[PDB]
Enzyme design. Sequence first.
Site, PDB file in Angstrom:
ATOM      1  N   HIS B 219       0.839  -1.189   0.000  1.00 31.49           N
ATOM      2  CA  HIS B 219       0.000   0.000   0.000  1.00 31.49           C
ATOM      3  C   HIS B 219       0.887   1.255   0.000  1.00 31.49           C
ATOM      4  O   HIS B 219       1.757   1.392  -0.859  1.00 31.49           O
ATOM      5  CB  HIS B 219      -0.973  -0.049   1.188  1.00 31.49           C
ATOM      6  N   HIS B 259      -1.663  -1.916  -9.633  1.00 30.90           N
ATOM      7  CA  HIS B 259      -2.787  -1.366  -8.901  1.00 30.90           C
ATOM      8  C   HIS B 259      -3.938  -2.359  -8.897  1.00 30.90           C
ATOM      9  O   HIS B 259      -4.035  -3.201  -9.788  1.00 30.90           O
ATOM     10  CB  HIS B 259      -3.235  -0.058  -9.553  1.00 30.90           C
ATOM     11  N   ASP B 314       2.803   6.015  -6.332  1.00 23.61           N
ATOM     12  CA  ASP B 314       3.940   5.976  -5.422  1.00 23.61           C
ATOM     13  C   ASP B 314       5.284   6.013  -6.141  1.00 23.61           C
ATOM     14  O   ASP B 314       6.299   6.351  -5.529  1.00 23.61           O
ATOM     15  CB  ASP B 314       3.859   4.757  -4.497  1.00 23.61           C
TER      16      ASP B 314
HETATM   17  C1  LIG Z   1      -0.900  -3.019  -5.785  1.00 23.95           C
HETATM   18  C2  LIG Z   1      -0.938  -4.435  -5.973  1.00 23.95           C
HETATM   19  C3  LIG Z   1      -0.944  -5.087  -4.695  1.00 23.95           C
HETATM   20  C4  LIG Z   1      -2.242  -4.768  -6.694  1.00 23.95           C
HETATM   21  O1  LIG Z   1      -2.267  -6.134  -7.098  1.00 23.95           O
HETATM   22  P1  LIG Z   1      -3.590  -7.025  -6.892  1.00 23.95           P
HETATM   23  O2  LIG Z   1      -4.738  -6.319  -7.571  1.00 23.95           O
HETATM   24  O3  LIG Z   1      -3.704  -7.389  -5.430  1.00 23.95           O
HETATM   25  O4  LIG Z   1      -3.271  -8.354  -7.740  1.00 23.95           O
HETATM   26  P2  LIG Z   1      -2.418  -9.580  -7.142  1.00 23.95           P
HETATM   27  O5  LIG Z   1      -1.544  -9.091  -6.012  1.00 23.95           O
HETATM   28  O6  LIG Z   1      -3.359 -10.738  -6.916  1.00 23.95           O
HETATM   29  O7  LIG Z   1      -1.442  -9.954  -8.368  1.00 23.95           O
HETATM   30  C5  LIG Z   1      -1.906 -10.334  -9.670  1.00 23.95           C
HETATM   31  C6  LIG Z   1      -0.716 -10.716 -10.558  1.00 23.95           C
HETATM   32  O8  LIG Z   1      -0.024  -9.554 -11.024  1.00 23.95           O
HETATM   33  C7  LIG Z   1       1.352  -9.589 -10.624  1.00 23.95           C
HETATM   34  N1  LIG Z   1       1.811  -8.243 -10.202  1.00 23.95           N
HETATM   35  C8  LIG Z   1       1.038  -7.251  -9.723  1.00 23.95           C
HETATM   36  N2  LIG Z   1       1.773  -6.146  -9.439  1.00 23.95           N
HETATM   37  C9  LIG Z   1       3.053  -6.429  -9.742  1.00 23.95           C
HETATM   38  C10 LIG Z   1       4.349  -5.713  -9.689  1.00 23.95           C
HETATM   39  N3  LIG Z   1       4.426  -4.439  -9.237  1.00 23.95           N
HETATM   40  N4  LIG Z   1       5.454  -6.377 -10.106  1.00 23.95           N
HETATM   41  C11 LIG Z   1       5.398  -7.647 -10.556  1.00 23.95           C
HETATM   42  N5  LIG Z   1       4.258  -8.354 -10.633  1.00 23.95           N
HETATM   43  C12 LIG Z   1       3.074  -7.812 -10.248  1.00 23.95           C
HETATM   44  C13 LIG Z   1       1.441 -10.601  -9.492  1.00 23.95           C
HETATM   45  O9  LIG Z   1       2.708 -11.266  -9.465  1.00 23.95           O
HETATM   46  C14 LIG Z   1       0.311 -11.557  -9.815  1.00 23.95           C
HETATM   47  O10 LIG Z   1       0.793 -12.511 -10.752  1.00 23.95           O
HETATM   48  P3  LIG Z   1       0.869 -14.082 -10.431  1.00 23.95           P
HETATM   49  O11 LIG Z   1      -0.582 -14.505 -10.391  1.00 23.95           O
HETATM   50  O12 LIG Z   1       1.654 -14.626 -11.607  1.00 23.95           O
HETATM   51  O13 LIG Z   1       1.595 -14.161  -9.103  1.00 23.95           O
HETATM   52  C15 LIG Z   1       0.286  -4.879  -6.792  1.00 23.95           C
HETATM   53  O14 LIG Z   1       0.328  -4.170  -8.041  1.00 23.95           O
HETATM   54  C16 LIG Z   1       1.589  -4.674  -6.064  1.00 23.95           C
HETATM   55  O15 LIG Z   1       1.999  -5.527  -5.296  1.00 23.95           O
HETATM   56  N6  LIG Z   1       2.250  -3.542  -6.318  1.00 23.95           N
HETATM   57  C17 LIG Z   1       3.629  -3.310  -5.926  1.00 23.95           C
HETATM   58  C18 LIG Z   1       3.751  -2.380  -4.721  1.00 23.95           C
HETATM   59  C19 LIG Z   1       3.089  -1.047  -4.990  1.00 23.95           C
HETATM   60  O16 LIG Z   1       3.541  -0.297  -5.844  1.00 23.95           O
HETATM   61  N7  LIG Z   1       2.015  -0.766  -4.243  1.00 23.95           N
HETATM   62  C20 LIG Z   1       1.346   0.525  -4.257  1.00 23.95           C
HETATM   63  C21 LIG Z   1       0.018   0.490  -5.006  1.00 23.95           C
HETATM   64  S1  LIG Z   1      -0.664   2.117  -5.110  1.00 23.95           S
HETATM   65  C22 LIG Z   1      -0.593   3.071  -3.884  1.00 23.95           C
HETATM   66  C23 LIG Z   1      -0.590   2.744  -2.835  1.00 23.95           C
HETATM   67  O17 LIG Z   1      -1.347   1.793  -2.443  1.00 23.95           O
HETATM   68  O18 LIG Z   1      -0.209   3.421  -2.080  1.00 23.95           O
HETATM   69  O1  LIG Z   2      -6.498   2.613  -4.509  1.00 17.79           O
HETATM   70  C1  LIG Z   2      -5.620   1.791  -3.988  1.00 17.79           C
HETATM   71  O2  LIG Z   2      -5.846   0.506  -3.891  1.00 17.79           O
HETATM   72  C2  LIG Z   2      -4.305   2.317  -3.473  1.00 17.79           C
HETATM   73  C3  LIG Z   2      -4.024   3.729  -3.925  1.00 17.79           C
HETATM   74  O3  LIG Z   2      -3.681   4.016  -5.154  1.00 17.79           O
HETATM   75  C4  LIG Z   2      -4.158   4.807  -2.882  1.00 17.79           C
HETATM   76  O4  LIG Z   2      -4.708   4.538  -1.724  1.00 17.79           O
HETATM   77  O5  LIG Z   2      -3.714   6.000  -3.173  1.00 17.79           O
END
Ligand SMILES: CC(C)(COP(=O)(O)OP(=O)(O)OC[C@H]1O[C@@H](n2cnc3c(N)ncnc32)[C@H](O)[C@@H]1OP(=O)(O)O)[C@@H](O)C(=O)NCCC(=O)NCCSCC(=O)O
Ligand SMILES: O=C([O-])CC(=O)C(=O)O
Lengths: 381, 380
Positions: B219, B259, B314
């Site tokens: 997050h 995301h 981020d």
């Molecule tokens: C934000 C997320 C958790 C959203 O993912 P999600 O909707 O929960 O999907 P999920 O976690 O089930 O993953 C689906 C597939 O995509 C892949 N995937 C998703 N994001 C990434 C990434 N950044 N790098 C590599 N692979 C990824 C993941 O490996 C999975 O594939 P597999 O089934 O082969 O393992 C993910 O993109 C992530 O881990 N991001 C990296 C950390 C990050 O930048 N987080 C900040 C998000 S935005 C702002 C914020 O929250 O503050």
């Molecule tokens: O919407 C989300 O899942 C995370 C995000 O980009 C934020 O809280 O700014």
Amino acid sequence: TEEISKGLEDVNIKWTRLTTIDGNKGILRYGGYSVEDIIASGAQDEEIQYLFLYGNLPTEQELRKYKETVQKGYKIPDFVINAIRQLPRESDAVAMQMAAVAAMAASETKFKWNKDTDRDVAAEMIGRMSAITVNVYRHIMNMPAELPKPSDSYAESFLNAAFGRKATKEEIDAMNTALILYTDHEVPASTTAGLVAVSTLSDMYSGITAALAALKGPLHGGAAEAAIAQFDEIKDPAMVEKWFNDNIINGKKRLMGFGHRVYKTYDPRAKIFKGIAEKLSSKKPEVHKVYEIATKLEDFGIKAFGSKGIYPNTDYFSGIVYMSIGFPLRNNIYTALFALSRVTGWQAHFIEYVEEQQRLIRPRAVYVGPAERKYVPIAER
Amino acid sequence: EEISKGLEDVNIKWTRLTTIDGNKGILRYGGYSVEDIIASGAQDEEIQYLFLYGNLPTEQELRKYKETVQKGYKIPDFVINAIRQLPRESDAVAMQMAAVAAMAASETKFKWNKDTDRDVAAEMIGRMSAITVNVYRHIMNMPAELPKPSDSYAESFLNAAFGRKATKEEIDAMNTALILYTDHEVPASTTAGLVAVSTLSDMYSGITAALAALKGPLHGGAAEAAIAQFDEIKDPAMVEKWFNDNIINGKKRLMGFGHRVYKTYDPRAKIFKGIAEKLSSKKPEVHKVYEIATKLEDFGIKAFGSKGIYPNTDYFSGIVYMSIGFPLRNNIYTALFALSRVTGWQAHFIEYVEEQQRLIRPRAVYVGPAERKYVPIAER
Ligand SMILES: CC(C)(COP(=O)(O)OP(=O)(O)OC[C@H]1O[C@@H](n2cnc3c(N)ncnc32)[C@H](O)[C@@H]1OP(=O)(O)O)[C@@H](O)C(=O)NCCC(=O)NCCSCC(=O)O
Ligand SMILES: O=C([O-])CC(=O)C(=O)O
Ligand SMILES: CC(C)(COP(=O)(O)OP(=O)(O)OC[C@H]1O[C@@H](n2cnc3c(N)ncnc32)[C@H](O)[C@@H]1OP(=O)(O)O)[C@@H](O)C(=O)NCCC(=O)NCCSCC(=O)O
Ligand SMILES: O=C([O-])CC(=O)C(=O)O
């Protein structure tokens, strides 16, 4: 995709091996073992604690090993104690527990999710929770700070430090039942909040903090005080009918200690808590007067709400049990003793989520607000 | 029926606050696009007001509103001490938790109320400024300081944090960052907070729960974990090797990418990128961090863009905070995210409790051991 899951009713957020609930027939099991069977056998809390972290009941060797890992948590830093003691004395007890665990979340810069270390971190925190709760209670009661010492039981170790005296066999046993009874309940609001936090891969202590934040609320663990507060408010047993018609039936307030999202019948833990509330309160006449108001209101409650599936929950009698033990009706302490127990369940659920079924928790909302529109500079507004 | 893994596409509430089109990359606050707001040079307080009251303020209403926010610039010493008594190497967001947790304790007279909720929230927004100033100062080993009234909320925050006069460039950059992080519908943090308030627990505990969730690297923690990747690389020439060794081989996730909702370029990221460029180019050591970031971006899109995984908010924000003068340590960048997000958090909690209150209590699927009698200790 445009329908609202109100309160997330019947939505499955995870799978679990830890706790099963039969809302229809009123059955609660911990790892397959029914909560009645566990009390009947006179089990210690440490055995149930061990069950949630490991998956089965401990042998004599494993239980002895487990206690020493818990007792490590009886020693906590001065800033952790001070996190409680520097707050206004009239503060909420659960929020005090919140503040203390938040200090741990901050200081514990080396925590990492790992299957080898998780259960040990958990076991020590269960000990840390005891040490925290003692000091929460002591600070509220204007007493000096103290830490729990190792003893024959977790319940005794806690009670001895909290009151600053040797607790009786009967006192230790009743606290031991309360700790078992509040251990876990699948995924209520507190556990859910903690799971949402831990789903971001934030630390265990943050999860516990988010859980505590939810548990503090009147519709959740806050009922542990809010129910008995009703009994305290009525005073005269003959006044019960009038109070019930005046406060609940006219539609002003909900009946605290009654109702559940899952149970449409009498709460299993409420049976056990009542029997113990009856036994211990009958030894203290002024406490028994509370119980005899409680049972009277319970009857009016069951008759008025039973057909709608609203029945007494685990918080309706639990407060009387704690009052019988020695804890006063103030500062939400009963909810803090609830929390003292639920930390085991909370932690076991976060570990089970991260290790074996990790995924960020991120729902949606149906937009119902203003349509697309041009920004208007403040000068011409 | 069974498991809604991660609660994907499950609706938890309705909102009037924020809209997200994950497919087009569109973000609106109360119907105003984020690009419209930034281009207009709108004050953060205007957007704060928008979230609490439902419309944009008039000049008279903005004067009244600023008065209420500034009340939170004075916080009790135990709230400041809830920060300062902790080890300095502590996580910054976790330090914010401790502070807000102390408020949740002391604020024994808090009631969910139609008439009071918005003033409470406005004052807390101010209080979050005070907290963040003191979180940053304690970490850096500096004396305690409070924000003072001025022209803008951002200026009042920056001045107090650094103890110097912030330049016009720094103030505008911070103002934009505050708007861009204000809200994002119901992410993990906001949800964690909503679960808390659905028990009718207090606003502060709601914020505390949200802060616990925002800490995590999946997050808000990515606000530091993303920029940490650029710091590891050091040499633009070694970008390809780092991306090959750690992501494609090591299977570690590329932070600042991906995301739950956006399956395209994050609109906030796009805006953050432009500012990261403008601010870093002037100071050599930050400029090359941006140069590493944009070079890693191309490898990121080429590899993950076809899978719906693009730069998120981020990815570039860290560089923007670094250029303003905040160091890359103690998850400070996630704490600045929080400072902004508290407006969105509070608006959602009020919205949920006032007009659609119900206890959030889901279920789980049982796969554990079948019914069994309590075994004696030695059998086993
Ligand atoms: C934000 C997320 C958790 C959203 O993912 P999600 O909707 O929960 O999907 P999920 O976690 O089930 O993953 C689906 C597939 O995509 C892949 N995937 C998703 N994001 C990434 C990434 N950044 N790098 C590599 N692979 C990824 C993941 O490996 C999975 O594939 P597999 O089934 O082969 O393992 C993910 O993109 C992530 O881990 N991001 C990296 C950390 C990050 O930048 N987080 C900040 C998000 S935005 C702002 C914020 O929250 O503050
Ligand atoms: O919407 C989300 O899942 C995370 C995000 O980009 C934020 O809280 O700014
Ligand atoms: C626990 C509950 C929130 C669960 O309710 P829920 O499953 O979220 O359903 P809901 O809140 O939409 O209520 C459904 C209907 O039943 C009514 N109702 C539910 N509980 C009660 C009660 N205790 N008294 C009066 N009416 C009630 C409610 O008014 C609503 O009526 P209508 O359909 O006419 O609007 C509720 O029973 C309650 O508020 N109980 C009282 C507080 C309490 O004892 N809480 C502790 C629960 S147990 C453990 C614990 O968490 O510590
Ligand atoms: O199961 C629930 O919804 C709440 C409850 O009884 C508990 O957490 O003890």
